[PDB]
Amino acid sequence: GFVGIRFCQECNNMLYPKEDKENRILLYACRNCDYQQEADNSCIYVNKITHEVDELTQIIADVSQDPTLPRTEDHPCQKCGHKEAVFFQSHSARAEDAMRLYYVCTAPHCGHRWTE
Amino acid sequence: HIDQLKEREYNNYSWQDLVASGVVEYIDTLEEETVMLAMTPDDLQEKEVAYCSTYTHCEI
Ligand SMILES: [Zn+2]
């Protein structure tokens, strides 16, 4: 789980958290305005030391139409089942230690991505 | 194109004709990073182990 910013309703600014001492609940107040709203996530901050980020979430379907990207026929797609497919490393800095590929289907209207 | 160019000097045929015809193209150092360049036209395209088979350009 993570936590996202929730803007105010009137002034549209950052809402800081607040622990209601009276009703013993979690609130989000506004620095300028006096808006209040009852919380639901019961979380404020989370830190990922390992930074276990799913590279698949960053990959896009447009990578398929790349003329300087390798293609293989031995790793067909799952949904559509097309043969042609591309493969490449994380291509992201701060790679811990892994050259694990991220296969992406090479066909319109699919944009599927998987890993083996 | 080769025949029309070999008879240059005599008539009026020059490099501008090749550029306009759509055979050559000026790629700068910043764009050269997003094109599958090829060394020779014949050797690197015939039919072998599938390397890329998606060459976009080719050096002279
Ligand atoms: Zn506010």
Ligand SMILES: [Zn+2]
């Ligand atoms: Zn597919």
